[PDB]
């Protein structure tokens, strides 16, 4: 079975920032750069 | 937090408006120039308070939305019975709570 990323899943960089997906946002409204390229994932600073 | 903090930028020329009237004018124009900031260490009122005075509560934030005053900037405002020298953000926090529970006072 194919497992597409979902809210229950947990991803983490090689440094240790571990975390779970809490919301899949519509590309519609998430943080976008001046040129229309939007961001894929928004990491909280407080965990740093 | 970030919404209620106030800022302080550059102290170069005199910070004395407590007394001279030439002090209001000169440090207002010099501020308009590049020498005095909107948040300068000048006891009574940094020119940032000199420039903007807000009558009603709302008046304050509108200026913020239009790009006149950042939330963390030091400005003067007229609340219930006092002329209070408090920043936008701080004034806004006030409302959040004042609204959460309507017993404003």
């Amino acid at each position: 079975q194919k497992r597409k990323l979902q809210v229950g899943d947990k991803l983490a960089n090689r440094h240790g920032n571990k975390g779970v997906v809490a919301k899949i946002l519509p590309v519609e409204d998430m943080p976008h750069l001046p040129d229309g390229t939007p961001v894929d994932v928004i990491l909280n600073p407080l965990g740093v | 937090y970030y919404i209620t903090q106030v800022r302080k930028e550059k102290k170069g020329a005199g910070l004395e408006f407590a007394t001279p009237e030439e002090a209001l004018a000169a440090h207002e124009r010099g501020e308009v120039a590049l020498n005095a900031p909107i948040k300068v260490a000048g006891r009574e009122t940094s020119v940032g308070r000199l420039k903007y005075v807000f009558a009603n509560p709302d008046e304050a934030l509108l200026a913020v939305a239009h790009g006149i005053v950042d939330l963390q900037d030091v400005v003067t405002v007229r609340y219930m019975g006092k002329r209070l020298e408090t920043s936008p953000g701080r004034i806004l926090f006030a409302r959040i709570v004042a609204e959460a529970v309507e017993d404003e006072k």
Binding site: D9, L33, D35, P38, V39 | -
Partner: protein, 97 residues
């Protein structure tokens, strides 16, 4: 930003706006041109970002970039266990699955 120059346009009201708040912060050398300021601000690893929901900018430069990220395996426990009624141990009469 080079392509941005040639492609035909310059700087936003928004782009300048975040700059104002950025210099009052201390990220950009006051007095330089927005073009020059953004370079500075970029070198710092952060760039201007607009909300997306409102289209307004996010007061203060935010960092962004290519971060590698892996997905972690879901253990059998991950399978959220919800039980209404079911088996029961033979000697101890407490619920068993």
């Amino acid at each position: 930003f080079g392509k941005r120059k040639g492609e035909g346009f310059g700087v936003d009201k928004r782009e300048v706006e975040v700059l104002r708040r950025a210099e009052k912060l201390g990220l950009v050398t006051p007095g330089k041109t927005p073009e020059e300021q953004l370079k500075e601000l970029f070198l710092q690893g952060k760039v201007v970002l607009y909300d997306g929901r409102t289209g307004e900018p996010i007061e203060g430069p935010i960092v962004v970039g290519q971060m590698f990220i892996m997905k972690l395996y879901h253990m059998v426990e991950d399978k959220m266990h919800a039980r209404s009624t079911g088996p029961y141990s033979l000697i101890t009469q407490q619920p068993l699955g």
